[PDB]
Amino acid sequence: MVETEPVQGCRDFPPEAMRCRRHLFDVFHATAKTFGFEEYDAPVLESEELYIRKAGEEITEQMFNFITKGGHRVALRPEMTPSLARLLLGKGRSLLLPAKWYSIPQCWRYERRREHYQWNMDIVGVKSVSAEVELVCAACWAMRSLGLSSKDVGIKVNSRKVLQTVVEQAGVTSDKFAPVCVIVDKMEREEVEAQLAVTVVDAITTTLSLKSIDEIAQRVGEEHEAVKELRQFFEQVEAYGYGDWVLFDASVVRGLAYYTGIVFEGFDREGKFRALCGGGRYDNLLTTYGSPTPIPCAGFGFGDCVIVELLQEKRLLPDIPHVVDDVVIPFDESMRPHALAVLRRLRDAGRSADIILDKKKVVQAFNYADRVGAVRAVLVAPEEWERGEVQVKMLRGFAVPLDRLV
Amino acid sequence: MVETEPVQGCRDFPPEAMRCRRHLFDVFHATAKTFGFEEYDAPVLESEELYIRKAGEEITEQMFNFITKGGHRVALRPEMTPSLARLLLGKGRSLLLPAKWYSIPQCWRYERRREHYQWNMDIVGVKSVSAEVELVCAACWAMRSLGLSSKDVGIKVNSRKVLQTVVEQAGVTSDKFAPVCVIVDKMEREEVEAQLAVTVVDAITTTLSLKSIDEIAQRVGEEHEAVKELRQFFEQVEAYGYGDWVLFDASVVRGLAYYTGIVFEGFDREGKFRALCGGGRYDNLLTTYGSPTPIPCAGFGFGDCVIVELLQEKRLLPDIPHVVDDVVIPFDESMRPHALAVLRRLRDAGRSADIILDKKKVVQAFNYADRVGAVRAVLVAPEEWERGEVQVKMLRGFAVPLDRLV
Numbered sequence: 001m002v003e004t005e006p007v008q009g010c011r012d013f014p015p016e017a018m019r020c021r022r023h024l025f026d027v028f029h030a031t032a033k034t035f036g037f038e039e040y041d042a043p044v045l046e047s048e049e050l051y052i053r054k055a056g057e058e059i060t061e062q063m064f065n066f067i068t069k070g071g072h073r074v075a076l077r078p079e080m081t082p083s084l085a086r087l088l089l090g091k092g093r094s095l096l097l098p099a100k101w102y103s104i105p106q107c108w109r110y111e112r113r114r115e116h117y118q119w120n121m122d123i124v125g126v127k128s129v130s131a132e133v134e135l136v137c138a139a140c141w142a143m144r145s146l147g148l149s150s151k152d153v154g155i156k157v158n159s160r161k162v163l164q165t166v167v168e169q170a171g172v173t174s175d176k177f178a179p180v181c182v183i184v185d186k187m188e189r190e191e192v193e194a195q196l197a198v199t200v201v202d203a204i205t206t207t208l209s210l211k212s213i214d215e216i217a218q219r220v221g222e223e224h225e226a227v228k229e230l231r232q233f234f235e236q237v238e239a240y241g242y243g244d245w246v247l248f249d250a251s252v253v254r255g256l257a258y259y260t261g262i263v264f265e266g267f268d269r270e271g272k273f274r275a276l277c278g279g280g281r282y283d284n285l286l287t288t289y290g291s292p293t294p295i296p297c298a299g300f301g302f303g304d305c306v307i308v309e310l311l312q313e314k315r316l317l318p319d320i321p322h323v324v325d326d327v328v329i330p331f332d333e334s335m336r337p338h339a340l341a342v343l344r345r346l347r348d349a350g351r352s353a354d355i356i357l358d359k360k361k362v363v364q365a366f367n368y369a370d371r372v373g374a375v376r377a378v379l380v381a382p383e384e385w386e387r388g389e390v391q392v393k394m395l396r397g398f399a400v401p402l403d404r405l406v
Numbered sequence: 407m408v409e410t411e412p413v414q415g416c417r418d419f420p421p422e423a424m425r426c427r428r429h430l431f432d433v434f435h436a437t438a439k440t441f442g443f444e445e446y447d448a449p450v451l452e453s454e455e456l457y458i459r460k461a462g463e464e465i466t467e468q469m470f471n472f473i474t475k476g477g478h479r480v481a482l483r484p485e486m487t488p489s490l491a492r493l494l495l496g497k498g499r500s501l502l503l504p505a506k507w508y509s510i511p512q513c514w515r516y517e518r519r520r521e522h523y524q525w526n527m528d529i530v531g532v533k534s535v536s537a538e539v540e541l542v543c544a545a546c547w548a549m550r551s552l553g554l555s556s557k558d559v560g561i562k563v564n565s566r567k568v569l570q571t572v573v574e575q576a577g578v579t580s581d582k583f584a585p586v587c588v589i590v591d592k593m594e595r596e597e598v599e600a601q602l603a604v605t606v607v608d609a610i611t612t613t614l615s616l617k618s619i620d621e622i623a624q625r626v627g628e629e630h631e632a633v634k635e636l637r638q639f640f641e642q643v644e645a646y647g648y649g650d651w652v653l654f655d656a657s658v659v660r661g662l663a664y665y666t667g668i669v670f671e672g673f674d675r676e677g678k679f680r681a682l683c684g685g686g687r688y689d690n691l692l693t694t695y696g697s698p699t700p701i702p703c704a705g706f707g708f709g710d711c712v713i714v715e716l717l718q719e720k721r722l723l724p725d726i727p728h729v730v731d732d733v734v735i736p737f738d739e740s741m742r743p744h745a746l747a748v749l750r751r752l753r754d755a756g757r758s759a760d761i762i763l764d765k766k767k768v769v770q771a772f773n774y775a776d777r778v779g780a781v782r783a784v785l786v787a788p789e790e791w792e793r794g795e796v797q798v799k800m801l802r803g804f805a806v807p808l809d810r811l812v
């Protein structure tokens with residue numbers, strides 16, 4: 001007996017499970033098309049240098065890396081964004097901007113699950129908060145398409161620029177800002193104070209606990225960069241009709257080094273699950289990768305696990321049975337040639353159809369039709385075939401001419 | 407500057423290239439649904455033991471394998487069939503048969519390209535040639551859906567049972583049959599005679615060169631296992647309406663150890679390309695993996711490269727431009743809130759729509775609309791907004807009430 005279980009921390013998707021995944025992905029695709037994003041993809045295997053950021057990020061700590069026989073340092077991607085940037089930087093001046101790109105890559109880690117699929121959506125070449133508005137709306141749109149409401153979930157929103165100001169105004173060099181976000185992201189675990197030592201810590205704490213935009217306007221003015229952007233953001237989301245889905249939370253920073261402005265997280269309103277999705281603006285990434293001109297970017301990742309737990313809890317993942325329009329049933333083996341001709345007509349006309357492949361009695365064929373979720377069974381029998389007909393029976397036995405089956 | 411090229415032997419899919427891939431995959435999916443197959447998937451990372459067959463197969467020679475930090479021998483799958491069998495064997499008695507499963511996995515090698523996507527289609531629990539008929543028809547159906555005809559391509563068909571008889575009748579132990587197929591598959595390169603030594607070689611040669619089923623009927627009878635099956639196969643394909651797509655070729659064995667019966671290959675009728683797809687029956691695989699009951703199986707793999715070359719040569723891959731139904735254009739920033747409300751209505755009604763995200767003049771917005779392949783541009787201007795209207799202009803400027811846009 002061979003080992004039937006999959007490799008450690010990896011999922012099998014037999015047809016039952018695959019229908020569930022495909023239900024989720026159909027939404028990701030449909031939302032992307034509704035929002036005018038273009039699909040792209042890149043190798044799951046990337047060069048390890050792509051992810052060496054040196055900021056203590058959990059995503060790079062837990063990187064599934066290995067050495068080829070030719071001695072190259074490579075890894076199964078922990079995230080997609082660096083791949084996106086490589087492609088963008090590769091295209092250079094030939095890329096029309098603004099660009100809106102999406103994908104649903106499988107991403108990896110070594111530490112629990114070692115893989116997940118992650119919908120990625122990114123807008124490139126847009127400086128204004130209109131990008132983040134669109135992105136946050138897309139995420140809400142996908143969750144609403146899955147049957148969730150603003151009673152079920154929300155998106156917490158913030159700007160890193162606020163904290164940046166404090167880091168700056170507290171005489172704390174620009175260089176160290178990314179380390180601080182990464183540490184402060186760990187707040188939800190108790191001894192984050194210890195990491196920041198390795199005062200300006202206090203001002204960070206107070207600013208995370210500020211419960212409103214007015215309170216941040218009071219801390220650094222109604223026309224700070226962050227205040228105007230957040231107001232603009234909330235206004236646009238309100239106008240698009242998703243006001244009840246979004247809110248301000250000063251504690252949201254995200255764990256990734258490269259976020260420079262607005263950042264956001266989806267969450268369940270019952271407090272039962274980790275972040276449903278996550279993202280932000282990252283206007284400097286392409287500059288760090290060597291771009292001669294700064295390229296504004298923003299985007300998000302939306303995993304395939306947390307969302308499924310949430311949907312299961314809310315009872316929004318009813319089992320989806322397989323279906324097929326027709327099952328064609330030879331009365332016996334001598335009718336197979338004729339049954340095949342009929343299968344051809346049905347498929348020719350855009351229908352999904354099986355033919356009983358094995359030899360079996362009609363009643364067993366009918367049972368089989370019902371097991372595979374057939375809408376209709378088409379019996380091809382000698383006496384009917386002479387009249388130019390088949391027998392049709394709906395499952396969700398009148399005789400029918402061949403021309404009228406479609 | 408970061409390395410913009412992808413890892414060795416791996417392809418990037420920016421949006422242009424992705425539309426081409428998606429055009430191909432839409433066919434693979436659509437054909438699978440037309441033929442009633444159910445989608446499945448499994449980890450690209452499998453345990454290396456899955457592929458140790460010890461028959462000199464090129465697919466296992468060139469296996470992209472490596473050792474985890476925990477010391478496990480794993481590999482990026484060179485093919486899908488073993489993964490399929492693992493899943494099937496895992497399900498055991500709970501799996502309803504017959505089962506028809508498909509997927510489009512990315513598969514790997516280390517040696518040229520190191521990755522490709524491969525449509526897999528497999529029928530499980532069907533002893534009769536009706537399985538192989540369906541499979542071969544599915545492959546033809548996909549190629550016809552891509553615009554090819556029986557003048558462009560065909561499927562060569564054969565049974566390994568013929569050669570098995572010769573191997574047996576030539577006092578050559580059953581054990582060594584798989585090695586022989588793998589060697590004889592190399593015939594198309596000159597010194598295959600040398601490998602078979604490492605006589606019965608002559609009888610193998612003659613039987614590969616037999617140009618018809620009657621000639622094989624003359625060599626071992628009109629009621630050999632292989633003769634009846636091949637006749638049944640050609641009859642069923644004829645009846646389904648794909649007679650001009652298929653033909654007999656005694657030289658076709660395929661390179662994989664596990665094929666036991668009918669085997670087949672798609673090919674271009676100009677002799678310019680390698681095999682388009684390939685498959686056969688493999689009734690013993692699950693028995694070798696430890697199944698207590700023999701499970702008949704048959705299937706095929708259909709790669710994503712050769713087919714694309716062929717389609718390019720035949721001029722059947724016209725560039726596919728991106729499209730989107732509407733682009734919404736704020737007359738200026740003060741109209742953004744109103745433009746957003748309109749974007750909402752359009753998307754609500756099932757349309758794909760952008761809104762100009764950046765700040766720009768109307769003429770530039772219109773140009774942008776044309777670049778991204780918009781069918782329609784929707785200008786939201788102050789004077790029209792007061793009349794409850796927008797300006798609409800078709801690209802493939804009459805005023806319109808909001809209700810009538812959808």
Ligand SMILES: N[C@@H](Cc1c[nH]c[nH+]1)C(=O)O
Pocket residue numbers: 079080081120121122256278279280298299300301
């Ligand atoms: N790469 C981020 C998500 C993201 C996409 N684009 C920008 N951010 C993550 O893995 O959490």
Ligand SMILES: N[C@@H](Cc1c[nH]c[nH+]1)C(=O)O
Pocket residue numbers: 485486487526527528662684685686704705706707
């Ligand atoms: N695994 C085979 C194709 C196949 C699928 N099912 C049976 N055979 C190949 O890679 O060539």
Ligand SMILES: Nc1cnc2ccccc2c1
Pocket residue numbers: 059077078079107108109113114115116
């Ligand atoms: N880079 C990451 C992040 N989160 C994950 C969650 C589950 C499985 C794999 C993952 C890989």
Ligand SMILES: Nc1cnc2ccccc2c1
Pocket residue numbers: 465483484485513514515519520521522
């Ligand atoms: N196992 C295989 C077989 N053929 C391939 C062709 C191209 C790239 C990768 C491949 C992997």
